[PDB]
Amino acid sequence: AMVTAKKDENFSEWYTQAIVRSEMIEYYDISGCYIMRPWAFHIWEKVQRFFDDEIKKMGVENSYFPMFVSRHKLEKEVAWVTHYGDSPLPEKIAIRPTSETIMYPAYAKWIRSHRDLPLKLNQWCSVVRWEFKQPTPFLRTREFLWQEGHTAHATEEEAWELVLDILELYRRWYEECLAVPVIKGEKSEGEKFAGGKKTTTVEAFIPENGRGIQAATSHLLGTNFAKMFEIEFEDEEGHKRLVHQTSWGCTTRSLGVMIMTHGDDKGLVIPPRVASVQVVIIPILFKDENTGEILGKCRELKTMLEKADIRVRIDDRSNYTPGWKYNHWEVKGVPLRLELGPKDLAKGTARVVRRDTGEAYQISWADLAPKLLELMEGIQRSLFEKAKARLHEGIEKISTFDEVMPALNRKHLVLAPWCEDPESEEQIKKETQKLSEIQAIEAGDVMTGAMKTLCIPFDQPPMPEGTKCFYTGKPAKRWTLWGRSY
Amino acid sequence: AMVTAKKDENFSEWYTQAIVRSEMIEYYDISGCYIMRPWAFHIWEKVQRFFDDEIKKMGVENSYFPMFVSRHKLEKEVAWVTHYGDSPLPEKIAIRPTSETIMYPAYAKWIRSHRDLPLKLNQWCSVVRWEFKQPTPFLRTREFLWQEGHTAHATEEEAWELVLDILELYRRWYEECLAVPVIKGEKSEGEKFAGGKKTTTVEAFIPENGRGIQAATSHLLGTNFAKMFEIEFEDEEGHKRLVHQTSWGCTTRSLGVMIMTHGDDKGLVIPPRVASVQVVIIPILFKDENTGEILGKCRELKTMLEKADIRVRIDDRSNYTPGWKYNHWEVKGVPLRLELGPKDLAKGTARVVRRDTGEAYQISWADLAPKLLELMEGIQRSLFEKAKARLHEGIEKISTFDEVMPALNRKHLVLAPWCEDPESEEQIKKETQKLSEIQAIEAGDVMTGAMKTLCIPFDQPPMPEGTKCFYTGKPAKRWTLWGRSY
Numbered sequence: 009a010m011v012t013a014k015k016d017e018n019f020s021e022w023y024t025q026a027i028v029r030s031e032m033i034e035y036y037d038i039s040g041c042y043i044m045r046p047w048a049f050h051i052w053e054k055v056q057r058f059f060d061d062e063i064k065k066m067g068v069e070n071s072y073f074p075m076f077v078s079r080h081k082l083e084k085e086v087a088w089v090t091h092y093g094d095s096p097l098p099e100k101i102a103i104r105p106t107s108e109t110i111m112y113p114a115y116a117k118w119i120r121s122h123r124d125l126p127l128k129l130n131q132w133c134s135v136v137r138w139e140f141k142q143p144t145p146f147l148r149t150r151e152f153l154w155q156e157g158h159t160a161h162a163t164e165e166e167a168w169e170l171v172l173d174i175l176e177l178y179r180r181w182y183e184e185c186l187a188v189p190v191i192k193g194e195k196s197e198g199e200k201f202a203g204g205k206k207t208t209t210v211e212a213f214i215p216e217n218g219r220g221i222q223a224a225t226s227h228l229l230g231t232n233f234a235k236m237f238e239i240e241f242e243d244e245e246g247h248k249r250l251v252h253q254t255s256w257g258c259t260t261r262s263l264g265v266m267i268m269t270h271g272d273d274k275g276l277v278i279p280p281r282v283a284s285v286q287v288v289i290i291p292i293l294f295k296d297e298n299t300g301e302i303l304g305k306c307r308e309l310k311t312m313l314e315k316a317d318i319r320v321r322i323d324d325r326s327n328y329t330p331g332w333k334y335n336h337w338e339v340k341g342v343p344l345r346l347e348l349g350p351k352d353l354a355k356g357t358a359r360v361v362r363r364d365t366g367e368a369y370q371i372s373w374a375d376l377a378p379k380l381l382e383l384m385e386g387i388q389r390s391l392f393e394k395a396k397a398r399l400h401e402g403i404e405k406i407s408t409f410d411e412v413m414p415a416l417n418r419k420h421l422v423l424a425p426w427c428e429d430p431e432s433e434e435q436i437k438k439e440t441q442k443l444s445e446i447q448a449i450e451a452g453d454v455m456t457g458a459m460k461t462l463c464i465p466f467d468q469p470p471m472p473e474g475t476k477c478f479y480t481g482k483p484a485k486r487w488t489l490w491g492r493s494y
Numbered sequence: 495a496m497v498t499a500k501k502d503e504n505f506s507e508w509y510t511q512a513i514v515r516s517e518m519i520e521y522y523d524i525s526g527c528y529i530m531r532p533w534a535f536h537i538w539e540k541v542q543r544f545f546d547d548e549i550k551k552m553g554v555e556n557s558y559f560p561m562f563v564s565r566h567k568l569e570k571e572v573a574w575v576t577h578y579g580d581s582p583l584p585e586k587i588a589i590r591p592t593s594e595t596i597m598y599p600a601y602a603k604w605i606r607s608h609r610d611l612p613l614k615l616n617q618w619c620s621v622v623r624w625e626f627k628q629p630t631p632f633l634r635t636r637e638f639l640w641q642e643g644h645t646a647h648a649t650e651e652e653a654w655e656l657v658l659d660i661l662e663l664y665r666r667w668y669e670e671c672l673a674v675p676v677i678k679g680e681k682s683e684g685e686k687f688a689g690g691k692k693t694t695t696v697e698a699f700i701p702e703n704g705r706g707i708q709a710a711t712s713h714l715l716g717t718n719f720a721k722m723f724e725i726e727f728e729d730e731e732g733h734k735r736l737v738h739q740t741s742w743g744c745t746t747r748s749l750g751v752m753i754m755t756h757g758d759d760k761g762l763v764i765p766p767r768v769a770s771v772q773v774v775i776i777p778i779l780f781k782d783e784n785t786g787e788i789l790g791k792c793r794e795l796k797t798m799l800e801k802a803d804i805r806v807r808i809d810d811r812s813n814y815t816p817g818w819k820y821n822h823w824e825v826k827g828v829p830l831r832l833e834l835g836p837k838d839l840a841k842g843t844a845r846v847v848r849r850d851t852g853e854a855y856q857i858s859w860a861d862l863a864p865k866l867l868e869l870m871e872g873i874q875r876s877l878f879e880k881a882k883a884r885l886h887e888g889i890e891k892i893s894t895f896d897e898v899m900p901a902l903n904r905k906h907l908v909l910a911p912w913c914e915d916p917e918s919e920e921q922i923k924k925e926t927q928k929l930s931e932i933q934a935i936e937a938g939d940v941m942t943g944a945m946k947t948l949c950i951p952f953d954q955p956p957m958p959e960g961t962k963c964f965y966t967g968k969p970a971k972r973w974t975l976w977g978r979s980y
């Protein structure tokens with residue numbers, strides 16, 4: 009299978025082909041659920057190991073809470089269990105959409121003293137959000153894998169520092185592992201987590217459809233949940249005070265974002281840092297050659313590379329041509345391929361082809377390990393810098409509302425001065441929705457056309473005094489990133 | 495909190511105290527579900543890492559399949575989802591009790607050629623079995639964490655070899671990691687997995703209540719599921735043949751078995767190979783001492799031990815006495831404690847106390863790392879050998895049915911010659927159930943009294959010719975292990 013849809017022409021068909029023909033996903037009879045095959049699951053394991061190691065250094069501990077929540081606990085897009093076999097439960101129980109109402113009664117019991125704080129827990133599990141909108145493999149599904157962390161602190165300042173530290177870990181998850189550039193920012197009051205005080209986010213951008221997408225999230229819950237669940241601690245005075253809480257999560261959406269960011273017309277391109285196969289060795293196996301010698305040297309090279317921690321597989325299958333194998337591992341996104349035939353063996357070199365650019369190198373066997381390490385770092389860096397340039401070109405800085413629709417029609421995000429009044433965001437969503445529908449009827453034309461806030465970026469351009477809001481004309485408070493979204 | 499119930503007197507109360515006061519579990523409002531706190535979850539992560547590494551060496555790959563299964567797919571103790579919010583789904587969908595019916599349609603699609611075999615997949619997830627019997631934390635719960643592996647092979651012999659290789663991994667999981675002795679064997683026709691051809695098992699034994707328990711399971715499914723799901727492959731001839739399948743699983747039940755096996759009146763005893771804290775360092779901190787010097791040496795020793803891969807924590811909390819800390823870490827089962835005070839510092843030694851026997855050692859700082867490594871191996875081995883001696887003393891070899899009830903009253907298993915006729919197992923279950931109820935009414939007295947087969951052990955004692963079945967008098971075929979069970 010080759011990918012035949014072009015990424016810049018039919019992006020939806022291209023994406024489906026890339027994830028199916030690489031054997032990353034399989035479809036399923038229940039809408040919005042997808043099977044995650046090993047080729048994709050290996051990447052999830054890699055980013056999971058990364059994030060787990062990092063939060064353990066912060067003193068976060070893993071745990072496991074039940075997948076079921078009582079009606080009363082939850083009620084204090086949800087799939088309800090109502091019967092065991094054909095017997096009706098007295099109270100129906102819900103499948104977790106998130107675990108605040110499952111965990112926080114326990115927290116209230118566990119926390120008594122300032123000596124019990126901070127309390128830092130995480131769990132890896134799946135959650136269920138049963139919407140009816142258009143599902144997208146990896147990006148927006150009814151069941152998905154995630155991690156959710158939940159912490160409790162004696163002070164707001166300590167909780168806020170943790171929120172930001174986790175957000176930095178999510179920046180590293182995307183930018184350092186997956187080579188996807190993200191924008192750190194704060195959500196608007198309309199878009200933040202309802203029961204929380206402040207929601208921070210990293211946002212990603214999909215150029216081919218112009219859409220922003222929330223990559224991960226980190227919430228300062230403050231004391232609201234502590235009030236509702238009576239999570240209190242005693243200082244050394246003996247005075248009871250509410251804890252200050254955080255929660256934060258990130259999902260297999262990250263994989264989809266990586267796929268969309270780096271893929272090309274040939275299929276997947278997997279950044280070397282998360283590729284389960286970094287180097288595929290393809291021996292050339294003529295009938296009229298010493299095949300034993302060539303396969304032996306491939307095994308020697310595999311051992312030599314694995315001593316440098318390079319993840320290698322040899323595709324020595326005799327029933328497929330080298331051309332078939334080149335395409336097979338290109339579709340799967342292996343970042344380097346190493347070709348070895350009798351002429352290479354005679355010269356003591358190997359031919360290495362990088363997946364992102366197709367550039368080829370002749371490398372002597374003694375230089376192979378350090379040169380491939382350097383090449384993989386270069387591939388990783390180049391994937392990131394090109395995605396970052398696409399991000400910067402995808403954002404238009406505007407000053408008035410009449411620049412919105414043209415910028416959206418170019419599939420761009422807009423960075424605009426905003427008064428942050430929450431009524432104005434609703435007005436903007438509804439107006440851009442209506443104008444988008446008009447434009448659709450003029451084009452002769454599934455996913456919403458409305459523009460919403462994506463985030464208020466931590467990195468703020470200058471704000472000249474007396475800059476007006478781009479929609480209300482009221483005095484503008486901060487630069488805000490807007491766009492169509494998932 | 496100290497444990498105050500005695501293990502040999504009130505075993506159920508002892509178990510609850512040990513797992514609650516060590517902070518391993520927390521209760522939950524839904525019967526049969528329990529929260530797994532970090533102290534327990536760390537042990538699960540350890541055995542998970544072990545088993546994952548081992549099966550990856552066998553070429554098994556992890557994956558993730560949805561938690562939901564359609565009514566038709568399943569129907570081809572189950573919790574049914576029937577509504578999203580308060581809207582009724584056209585077909586109700588079930589939460590997975592096991593994933594054969596979720597995975598095998600996909601297998602049928604993926605397998606076309608002998609070149610596609612073997613196919614070896616595993617997943618780590620939770621499943622739901624919604625029974626109403628008495629739940630037991632770790633051992634028998636409505637939701638539990640497990641791994642389930644599913645493989646497909648071109649021949650029965652290859653599938654059978656895999657079944658046995660996995661069963662050996664489960665023996666290692668219990669005996670090598672958890673120091674719990676298990677018995678490998680084959681399940682009776684009445685107790686085997688229904689749709690499979692042959693079920694193998696490792697069985698454990700709980701002496702304090704006399705009960706056997708299935709520790710893990712590995713099934714030769716053969717071609718039955720291949721028939722039902724039309725999983726076929728083509729040889730190089732072009733003839734379509736059914737695949738031969740296996741499936742195998744093991745759960746957090748293993749943790750409960752470990753707890754019950756090694757615990758004592760003081761609480762948990764965690765084998766060093768899975769203990770998240772292997773050595774706890776407790777500084778003695780008099781008011782009238784150079785506390786800075788003692789804490790500094792504790793940190794030096796921690797660094798030195800961690801260079802030998804020993805997992806160390808220092809409990810330098812000033813507001814608790816050393817006696818309090820000794821009990822606190824004993825209850826949690828830390829296998830070694832290291833005490834350091836001014837006199838030790840003056841002598842250049844440390845006092846080390848092993849959790850299992852309470853024996854103390856004075857060890858010079860230079861010998862500390864290799865001596866503690868040797869001590870931990872000795873602790874691990876001694877935990878295992880004492881549990882193995884308890885297992886051997888808990889099994890009575892009998893020849894006639896009238897020895898059954900006395901052996902059961904001694905809380906023993908029986909090894910008996912058996913005709914393996916399936917009707918006889920039902921008769922034996924019902925008769926021993928009835929006799930147990932009579933005995934209960936004579937004692938002035940929740941869990942079933944019936945005796946069933948636990949397994950037909952791979953290791954068979956000699957079978958003198960003409961040995962009769964202990965219940966039917968028919969010619970006996972093999973020695974069978976029987977007992978009361980979970």
Ligand SMILES: Cc1cc(N2CC[C@@](C#N)(C3CC3)C2=O)cc(NC(=O)Cc2ccccc2)n1
Pocket residue numbers: 040137138139140141142143144146147148149150152154222223224225257258259260261
């Ligand atoms: C795969 C994935 C991811 C996420 N979300 C949420 C926000 C978040 C972030 N950031 C989580 C907090 C961490 C994220 O990734 C959400 C989802 N499904 C849904 O909303 C349900 C759905 C299904 C079909 C169509 C529309 C909606 N599906």
Ligand SMILES: Cc1cc(N2CC[C@@](C#N)(C3CC3)C2=O)cc(NC(=O)Cc2ccccc2)n1
Pocket residue numbers: 526623624625626627628629630632633634635636638640708709710711743744745746747
């Ligand atoms: C914790 C745990 C474990 C296991 N089982 C099963 C066999 C197996 C083995 N071997 C699995 C194949 C791997 C195992 O461990 C099973 C369970 N709950 C249940 O049966 C449901 C239940 C709940 C309350 C009372 C009675 C029954 N709960």
Ligand code: PRO
Pocket residue numbers: 106107108155156157201225227255256257258
């Ligand atoms: O869903 C959310 O956004 C928060 C963060 C993870 C748990 N709850």
Ligand code: PRO
Pocket residue numbers: 592593594641642643687711713741742743744
């Ligand atoms: O439940 C069982 O016993 C088998 C083995 C794991 C998956 N199904």
Ligand SMILES: [Cl-]
Pocket residue numbers: 321322323324
């Ligand atoms: Cl291969």
Ligand SMILES: [Cl-]
Pocket residue numbers: 466
């Ligand atoms: Cl900030």
Ligand SMILES: [Cl-]
Pocket residue numbers: 807808809810
């Ligand atoms: Cl501590």
Ligand SMILES: [Cl-]
Pocket residue numbers: 952
């Ligand atoms: Cl055998």
